[model samples]
Target: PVSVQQSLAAYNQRKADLVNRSIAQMREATTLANGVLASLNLPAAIEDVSGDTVPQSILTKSRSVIEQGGIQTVDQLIKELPELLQRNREILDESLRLLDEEEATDNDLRAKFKERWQRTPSNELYKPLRAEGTNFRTVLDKAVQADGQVKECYQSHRDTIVLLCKPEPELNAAIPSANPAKTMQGSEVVSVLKSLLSNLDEVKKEREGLENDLKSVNFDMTSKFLTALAQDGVINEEALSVTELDRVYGGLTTKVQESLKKQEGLLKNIQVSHQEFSKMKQSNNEANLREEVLKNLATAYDNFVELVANLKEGTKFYNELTEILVRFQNKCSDIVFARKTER
Candidate 1:
């Protein structure tokens, strides 16, 4: 029972780390969404801006290109104006075809056509497209990167499941050594203990494998979150409102916070890898050492677990959760750590 308590305590630290990372990711996602919206012209939402007037200077310079391309925003045709116009026209025609209103051509279709508007400049005196000077592409890229960070955090948190129970090699190895006091057969029960210990070791290894599998599932969750963010990012790049931008940010931040809290609650192991490793850099062999490396390791593990437990799991926390997990897991499963466990 004491061992179980210690294990749970260590696990708590990892969970804290995971929670903090998740919160960080949400902030990143929200920040990105906000930046994209700041770049666009829509006040509250996206709208068609087709009927808007074309500037004379822009029109005069772009007329030849527009004639070849068809007609659209100057920025829309970055390089190939003609081809772009043709494509735009084709899109409109397809829309018409879908409605099956081709036969009722008494100018009714033209009048009845939906009002298409573009994002025109509020002030004609100022430079037309330089309202906010916000770099749409850059904002979008940042948002994507932030979302990726969240995924990494989620992956690390998932790995925490592995720390739930590690093999107690000493306890396991002693299993088959036999205890005359508990023997059932003519021989001492030491042999039976040995067999049970071996089984426990095998179970420990299997537990690690299961944790890995769980981490894989967490990866899928991360992917799904990113995909949703991507779709939102696209909308932002095309057009977005101030309000909608906040919604995207708000949603991500909330979800991340929730995940962090869950992680904090579930971790269950607490043990340092070594006693010396806990604070001092002292080293000693098993026979003469005041403290073995494994003791220090177990201590480190326990401390790390506590770190995870202490995390606030709030919106403000920021860091890469996955990186932390990989680092911790590797240390715990190191040769020294395992060797000490065997001892």
Candidate 2:
């Protein structure tokens, strides 16, 4: 019996902990993604002068939300997060494609160099020039005068050989230009291409990391909250619908309204009785007792009224929460479906 009781208690606590962790994780992810989304929109011009209105209220509010709360104030961030991540993924895809093109161009240049120089008089023509401190142009110049295969190659492809034999051009141009006069070749070009590829690889990794984060958060939401109510037999619902949620909210609102009305009625009666006593003359002891009773009753009534107001506010807040969950579920359903299709 003790073991049974302990097991049941542990199971219930585990269930509660799971529910709390799930909700907390979703909240954390939503807040973090909303922050990222808000930061992504900061540089835009907020001069929204639409509807031909003269007052700048719309613009001011737009700027305020953008700077302070983002579209989270309007419940737009939750719906907009997937789209933002999707667009970022697309841009990264395009950038990777462009890098592939750049790599292809590098390959093309290397191929051209091999084709033009490979059939020359010397088989290993550029080997000497590949070394550090070996003057590329000077090596070619001396090779042109040598009585070996290098000389024969220089005379055979005179134009390329002569160009290679000239003094090296300026390493860089005076100013940044679309068509620069100077450019790299041979091992120098290869080195630069290698660095570019490495940089592009880093960016690709970052894109992949962001994609994974989005997928993880989205999948967690779908599995934990949106897909079904609960499978562990603790909860009886198989699937929950928006209409069902709304009905629950409606029932809560009705109960709160009933209790609030009763409290309000009691407060009204107390106020009326207090007023009736205030207008009558009485002995000192009687007046003191009546005043103290009235004061206590009034204070209790005021506190009760404040609590009723708060309950009504809570009901409205719950209704908003229910509506938000419904919208979030719909959006997450589409995302999960898309991910499934991709897989």
Candidate 3:
């Protein structure tokens, strides 16, 4: 039969392991959610959509629901899990009177055991000190149950909110054009053009931001930035000439510049196309704008579908974690009961 102290040690270790496992599960879920958020490029996409004919207040609220709430909830879990584990540790320590037991230990016995262990270890020769505690297993079981409830609540809440990102059926279909012969009202066309232009601007700004970040890392750290010094057109390249140094990093620079140029050209075309449509003031122009708007809407919907799917996957992970916790708790209950029977 296991000693009371041995049973308590096993129980404590099990509790600690469960706490660690819970934290790991939460971290995994957070990682999955964050990856989905990054892939969605949500903030920039929301900004692009915010300028549509939709009410600004509605747009702002929807953005907050997903962007602010989704991330903050997971971040809160990450921050709180360790504190919760500490509390569990504290509760178990109190129940077992661990500090008091340690304080009351004999120096002679401790020294004897330490010397014996160093010489040759044997479980039979040494034993864990037993201590009295009130319904320790009951305390542990209650704690596990409470933590499980908290996890379940969190998972349900996360799932409910994440499902809001599910895509609409229209996302799969081509955007229908407006009547070709019927001219759109000038005000309506203007709004459409403005929304499209705002979206293009947001994309451009994001591209520029990425370009700056890339240059700061890839160029500023290289000989390109450090060596090139110009004063009155008398350029210095440290060890190599300007042309030679350029050659060293110039291939990468050319590729990046070419990519940026293509992006700029596409944006310029969008601008010019809109300008031409506005000039013509024709029904066909309105129809074209409508089609483009629908395409953008569909793309946004598709992205959200993927985002929602990822969040659901995380929810499923949490659910599985909860199931494991339940199983652990039941086994702990059995162990605790067996200890009583043995006693």
Candidate 4:
């Protein structure tokens, strides 16, 4: 039988893995949506309808939807898949019902495109995703958490792409002056758009890679847990009696305790190194802020390990892993801070 502690540990580990995966998924969704939008010149989805050109008014209406905060990208539309699918079906039905009236023209296609794009989503465009919290960082943090609801965490991840792409009204709020000098120079806008278009695919590709990472955690980590248990008659060793199973598990527990002690020694070495470095740095250049951050991270990791040791082994492993993760988080924060300081 799986010990309660072991089961709890396994569940937390799985949850953590899922949270990490969900973040990657949302990021991927963002990338794909951005790529598709940029390819279209962020143009209204309608283009030439049959040789007959559709009126740009269809586009105007679509843009208005955006103005009204109703713009839904392909990603956002796909997110509430069932509802969007239903809307598409309804449009198809309506088109069939109206088919006899006239052969579909480019204009007809554009009109239909509007219908397709403008459906009320089961998930709100204004609101973030079901799993996602209202706060931006919270949503992102949840995406990176083990037990976080990924889909809900990224409900607005798609819509955000458009929002980022859309021109800020604040830029155009100024009334046009009679003087030519009053016209705002927008040369930078084109350059920015070009940069965004070019990088969209790169961003999307990164997201795809991250999604693969998600799948890997699910597959690799799940197998790892099962394999660990199956070994040494702790699980699925029906041929062995209870006495043998308990012996195996007890041995495993001892090994785990020893392993943790080894890890604690490693942590101590890190702490001592950090302390020695700081002392040496009083007379040298090695003690920079980033180095200090690393020391801080090591200290946090050490604390995390001790905390985990007091819990079930599974929980311990999860918390210990989080320490490594925290190091990366701290590093990221440092990089951003440094980048800003460079300016």
Model number with the top TM-score: 3
Superposing all C-alpha atoms, what RMSD in Å does each candidate have to the true structure? 32.6, 36.4, 18.8, 28.3
Point to the candidate with the largest lDDT. 3
TM-score of 3: 0.23
> Tens digits of per-residue lDDT for model 3 on 233-329?
3223232333442554355455445544555554445445555544755445655654354334433433343444444444454455445444544
The 10 consecutive residues of candidate 4 with the worst lDDT sum are 173-182
- Model 3 ranges with Cα > 4 A deviation: 1-177, 181-250, 283-296, 299-302, 305-343
Ranking by lDDT: 3, 4, 2, 1
TM-score of each: 0.17, 0.18, 0.23, 0.22
After TM-score superposition, what is the CA distance of residue 103 in candidate 3 from its true location, in Å?
Answer: 14
Ranking by TM-score: 3, 4, 2, 1
> For candidate 3, what is the total of clashing residue pairs?
0
Give one digit per residue, the lDDT tens place, for model 2 in 1-343: 2233343344445434533443444434434332332232111101111211212322333333345443132233223333433443343344334334434544555577866533322113323312311342243334234324422332343332112111222112111112211122223433443443344334324433433333343111223332233444332222222333334334433433443344344434433533442253433553343233223322222233233333344344444544543444444344334433542
On the 0 to 100 scale, the lDDT of residue 338 in model 1 is 39
lDDT of each: 0.31, 0.33, 0.41, 0.36
Runs in model 2 lying further than 4 Å from the true structure: 1-288
Candidate 3 clashing pairs? none
Candidate 1 lDDT for residue 27? 38
Clashes of each: 46, 0, 0, 9
Model 2 / residue 199 / CA error / Å = 74
Candidate 1 minimal-lDDT segment of 10 residues:
41-50
